[PDB]
């Protein structure tokens, strides 16, 4: 059901999404251990994910949540990095994509910092790095992140010690 | 998957020590996110 539409680097939509990626890189307290050492990305491709059944399933839940939160979906665009990105764009998010040991409970996690989600493209803590070179800071292998539409509704604010 | 806190649809995890670290968010239902853009990229070695 899923179709991928390539955006042109000359399209303002491509440039806007790249801008969100580049401008939300930060330094991480692990010195780069998990996601590698870098200040910016080389963006190779940005594709729109089109799936009618997944979108209708998303918008149906969004409507429900909206009606439960003084008519406010509280919808954000947030990054998600994961070894299972191929399963996510074809089948959607579900509990197998949930971080069981996350600081805020077993659920599906998203980041405002693109570089935070980059720490998880090869797994938790960067796993063993890229499959070809076993290098968490690989500058050669291609990585993939998702930039997702996320309905937060009424969000419980939890301050962390990070 | 866990449940969200009662009366809430998600959790906002907000770093309180590193002022430059942005927020992290958790949802507990797959239907509350849509993977809109797939971004293929490399990290670049600092010059
Ligand atoms: O990496 C994984 O390996 C497995 C292996 C099995 C199940 C789930 C996972 C995740 C766990 C956590 N995942 C993730 N966590 C976070 C952020 C993010 O983009 N992805 C950004 C905010 C900080 C937390 C991806 C899926
Ligand atoms: Zn590699």
Q: What would the DSSP string read from start to end of A139-153?
A: SSS-EEEEEEEEE--
Domain boundaries, chain B: 1-47
Strand ordering across the sheet containing B33-43: A3-6, A41-50, B33-43, A143-151, A75-80, A108-111, B24-27, B10-15, A155-160
Measured from the CB, is residue A109 less than 6 Å from ligand 1? yes
**Residue among B18, B23, B41 whose CB faces A43 most closely:** B41
Q: Other CB atoms closer than 10 Å to residue A131's CB: what's the count?
A: 12
Residues 6+ apart with CB under 8 A from A19: none
CA distance A154 to B11: 9
May I ask the CATH architecture of the domain B1-47? Other non-globular (6.20)
3 state SS of B6: coil
Domain that holds residue A87: 1-162
Q: How many residues does chain A have?
A: 162
CA distance B35 to A3: 12
Distances (CA, A) of A77 to A35, A42, A52, A108, B7: 21, 21, 19, 14, 23
B-proximal residues of A, 110-129, CB under 8 Å: 110-113, 116, 118
The C-alpha of B15 sits at a distance from chain A's nearest C-alpha, in angstroms, of 5
DSSP secondary structure letter of residue B26: E
Nearest to A146 by CA among A49, A53, A71: A49
On whether the CB atoms of residues B21 and B13 are closer than 8 A, the answer is: no
CA distance A157 to A140: 38
Nearest to A110 by CA among A100, A99, A95: A99
Q: Which residues pair with A103 in a beta bridge?
A: none
Mark yes or no for CB contact B9/A69 under 8 Å.
yes
Q: Is A148 annotated as a binding residue?
A: no
Measured in Å, residue A98 CA sits from the centre of ligand 1 at 7
Instruction: Say how far residue B33 (Cα) sits from the centre of its chain.
Output: 11
CA distance B42 to A98: 25
CA distance A100 to B10: 15
Q: A109, exposed or middle or buried, with CB in 10 Å at 0-12, 13-18, 19+?
A: buried
CA distance B16 to A67: 31
Q: Is A50 annotated as a binding residue?
A: no
First vs last C-alpha separation in chain A: 40
On whether the CB atoms of residues A20 and A26 are closer than 8 A, the answer is: no
Radius of gyration of chain B (CA): 16
Nearest to A47 by CA among A79, A88, A83, A89: A89
Helix (H) / strand (E) element for A89: namely helix A85-91
How many independent structural domains does chain A possess? Answer: 1
Residues 6+ apart with CB under 8 A from A83: A120, A121, A122, A123, A127
Measured in Å, residue A106 CA sits from the centre of ligand 2 at 30
Helix (H) / strand (E) element for A62: namely helix A52-68
**Residue among B2, B9, B42 whose CB faces A143 most closely:** B42
Q: Is A138 annotated as a binding residue?
A: yes
Q: Other CB atoms closer than 10 Å to residue A75's CB: what's the count?
A: 18
Interface test with A, best of B5, B7, B10 (most A CBs within 10 A): B10
CA distance A99 to A128: 18
């Amino acid at each position: 059901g899923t179709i991928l539409i390539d955006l042109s680097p000359d399209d303002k939509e491509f440039q806007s999404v790249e801008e969100e990626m580049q401008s939300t890189v930060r330094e991480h307290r692990d010195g780069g251990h998990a996601g590698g050492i870098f200040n910016r990305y080389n963006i190779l491709k940005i594709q729109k994910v089109c799936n009618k059944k997944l979108w209708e399933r998303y918008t149906h839940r969004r409507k429900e949540v909206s009606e439960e939160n003084h008519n406010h979906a509280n919808e954000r665009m947030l990054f998600h990095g994961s070894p299972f990105v191929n399963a996510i764009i074809h089948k959607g998010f579900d509990e197998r994509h949930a971080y069981i040991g996350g600081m805020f409970g077993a659920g599906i996690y998203f980041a405002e910092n693109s570089s935070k989600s980059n720490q998880y493209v090869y797994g938790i803590g960067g796993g063993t790095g890229c499959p070809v070179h076993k290098d968490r800071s690989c500058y050669i292998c291609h990585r993939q992140l998702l930039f997702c539409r996320v309905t937060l509704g009424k969000s419980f604010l939890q301050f962390s010690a990070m | 998957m866990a449940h969200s806190p009662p009366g809430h649809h998600s959790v906002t995890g907000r770093p309180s020590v590193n002022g430059l670290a942005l927020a992290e968010y958790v949802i507990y239902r797959g239907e509350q996110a849509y993977p809109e853009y797939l971004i293929t990229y490399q990290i670049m070695r600092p010059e």
